[PDB]
Design a protein around this ligand. Structure first.
Ligand SMILES: *Cc1cc2c(cc1C)nc1c(=O)[nH]c(=O)nc-1n2C[C@H](O)[C@H](O)[C@H](O)COP(=O)(O)OP(=O)(O)OC[C@H]1O[C@@H](n2cnc3c(N)ncnc32)[C@H](O)[C@@H]1O
Ligand SMILES: [Cl-]
Ligand SMILES: [Cl-]
Length: 387
């Protein structure tokens, strides 16, 4: 019975940000989510998320990283929820043996980002609690840091709803019916129509995009993290222990300083179980790798934080073949915007993506350069399920 200007399916990290940007402009928006964001069934829980500017995944992400940072500061001033803490972000690895470290330094140089460069014992000297080999080098970004992801989504939601946005919770979208001049969604709670559609279902994009005649390789991964009882005199944000993302022989790890004594949080990025969001086991510890992969890191590089496991969380990445995002219009429907495959590193950009999605939905174009996120790029292996 009711139409909308724009309908956002999946009101999570990207969708809720888009909802806020749309509502902010008086655009009558309906956001539909299978749950009640923020929640623990998607990819945004775990309390915290790292934001980096000097981007090791590729220096082309910097502009979006910087715009997103400015938007996070703006959100901080608009809500009572805590949004960002400037812990700084440390990146280290074996000298000359880390592509991630190399690209980070290059990204820094190329965009004139403020960073500190140090090696070996200088790393251990500066940050009691971190022990790396003499052959290790590092780049520290003082001004990037940590975002409180659940708070971000919560704030964007409260703000969007206050502006008129409608949020239909616990309602899973089951199908799509797209037309030349309108879009329609089917749910158990009723059907809804609008002029434009934004699709941002996270891990579920790998299962439901086929409903839009899109055949794109997207693989969901089970990715856990653990909070460990740590030596507060070394790992507390209060004593300036930084957030970090590093690359050692067996891969890439990321962590957060202890906030208010919650313990240092650590996650292993490189490995994760291939899963389906509908059958994934969300209990931490069911796989021996969950806790063992983390402690193996701590015992070697941050021994003082290898205490009791205080809490474990299970979350998901949705990877593309090239690990770059998908942000573009549906190849056959200019009134349909797709946001998918953030491959484990998209939260920091959610504020900026919200803006991009808003622009694409309203005008079919964006001021941002998102060519590398094209849904038609060859490295993606995208195609229609039947042309
Ligand atoms: C998992 C993970 C990810 C992660 C990270 C640590 C872990 C353990 N650390 C990060 C970090 O330090 N820095 C960073 O920049 N990113 C980091 N990430 C990745 C980031 O969290 C993800 O890229 C991000 O959350 C992706 O956002 P997206 O918006 O894609 O996913 P979501 O937040 O899960 O939202 C999807 C929503 O859509 C809903 N949904 C799903 N299916 C439906 C249907 N059928 N109908 C309606 N709604 C649907 C979900 O309920 C969800 O809310
Ligand atoms: Cl997490
Ligand atoms: Cl992801």
């Amino acid at each position: 019975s009711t139409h909308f200007d724009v309908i956002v399916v999946g009101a999570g990290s990207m969708g809720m940000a888009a909802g806020y940007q749309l509502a902010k402009q008086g655009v009558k928006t309906l956001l539909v989510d299978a749950f009640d964001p923020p929640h623990t069934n998607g990819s945004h829980h775990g309390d915290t998320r790292i934001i980096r500017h000097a981007y090791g995944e590729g220096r082309e992400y910097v502009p979006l990283a910087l715009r997103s940072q400015e938007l996070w500061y703006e959100l901080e001033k608009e809500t009572h929820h805590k949004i960002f803490t400037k812990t700084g972000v440390l990146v280290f690895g074996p000298k000359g043996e880390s592509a991630f470290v190399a690209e980070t330094m290059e990204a820094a140089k190329e965009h004139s980002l403020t960073v500190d460069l140090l090696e070996g014992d200088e790393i251990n000297k500066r940050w009691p609690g971190i022990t790396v080999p003499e052959n290790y080098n590092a780049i520290f970004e003082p001004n990037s840091g940590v975002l409180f992801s659940e708070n971000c989504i919560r704030a964007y939601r409260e703000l969007a709803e206050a502006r008129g946005a409608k949020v239909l919770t616990h309602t899973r979208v089951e199908d799509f019916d797209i037309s030349p001049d309108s879009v329609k969604i089917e749910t158990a709670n009723g059907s809804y129509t609008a002029d434009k559609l934004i699709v941002s279902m996270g891990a579920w994009n790998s299962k439901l995009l086929s409903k839009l005649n899109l055949d794109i390789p997207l693989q969901p991964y089970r990715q856990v993290v653990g909070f460990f009882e740590s030596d507060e005199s070394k790992y507390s944000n209060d004593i300036d222990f930084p957030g970090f993302m590093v690359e050692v022989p067996n891969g890439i790890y990321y962590g957060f300083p202890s906030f208010g004594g919650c313990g240092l949080k650590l996650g292993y990025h490189t490995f994760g179980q291939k899963i389906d969001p509908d059958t994934i086991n969300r209990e931490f510890g069911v796989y021996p790798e969950d806790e063992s992969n983390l402690r193996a890191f701590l015992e070697e590089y941050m021994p003082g934080a290898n205490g009791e496991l205080k809490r474990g969380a299970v979350c998901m990445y949705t990877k593309t073949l090239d690990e770059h995002f998908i942000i573009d219009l549906h190849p056959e429907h200019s009134n349909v915007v797709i946001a998918a495959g953030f491959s484990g590193h998209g939260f920091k950009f959610s504020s900026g993506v919200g803006e991009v999605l808003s622009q694409l939905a309203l005008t079919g174009k964006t001021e941002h350069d998102i060519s590398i996120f094209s849904i038609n790029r060859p490295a993606l292996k995208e195609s229609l399920q039947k042309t």
